[PDB]
Amino acid sequence: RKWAEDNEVQNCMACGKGFSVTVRRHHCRQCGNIFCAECSAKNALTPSSKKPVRVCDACFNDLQG
Ligand SMILES: [Zn+2]
Ligand SMILES: [Zn+2]
């Protein structure tokens, strides 16, 4: 356990949703913050590669600007 360790990811740090077996866990690679299907419901492309990466809405703005 150091930092981004899903091991303790059972509560979205954005909305505060309670993860479970019915919902899957998500985690933004740009900022490094675990998000739920509600905050991670977005995919933006990166200039370092041709592929839609999944990032929280917030980061989505840092790339669409
Ligand atoms: Zn959320
Ligand atoms: Zn982010």
From Swiss-Prot:
Changing residue 26 to A: Abolishes endosomal location. Abolishes pH sensitivity of the FYVE-type zinc finger domain. Signal peptide: none annotated. Changing residue 19 to A: Strongly reduces phosphatidylinositol 3-phosphate binding and endosomal location. Changing residue 59 to S: Abolishes phosphatidylinositol 3-phosphate binding and endosomal location. A zinc finger (FYVE-type) spans 6-64. Zn(2+) 1 binds at residues 12, 15, 36, 39. Zn(2+) 2 binds at residues 28, 31, 56, 59. Changing residue 39 to A: Abolishes phosphatidylinositol 3-phosphate binding and endosomal location. Changing residue 27 to A: Abolishes phosphatidylinositol 3-phosphate binding and endosomal location. Abolishes pH sensitivity of the FYVE-type zinc finger domain. It is found in: Cytoplasm; Early endosome membrane. Changing residue 3 to A: Reduces phosphatidylinositol 3-phosphate binding and endosomal location. The FYVE-type zinc finger domain mediates interactions with phosphatidylinositol 3-phosphate in membranes of early endosomes and penetrates bilayers. The FYVE domain insertion into PtdIns(3)P-enriched membranes is substantially increased in acidic conditions. Antibodies against EEA1 are found in sera from patients with subacute cutaneous lupus erythematosus and other autoimmune diseases. Binds phospholipid vesicles containing phosphatidylinositol 3-phosphate and participates in endosomal trafficking. Homodimer. Binds STX6. Binds RAB5A, RAB5B, RAB5C and RAB22A that have been activated by GTP-binding. Interacts with RAB31. Interacts with ERBB2. Interacts with SAMD9 and SAMD9L. May interact with PLEKHF2. This is Early endosome antigen 1. The lineage of its organism: Eukaryota, Metazoa, Chordata, Craniata, Vertebrata. The gene is EEA1. The chain holds residues 1347 to 1411 of 1411 of the full protein.
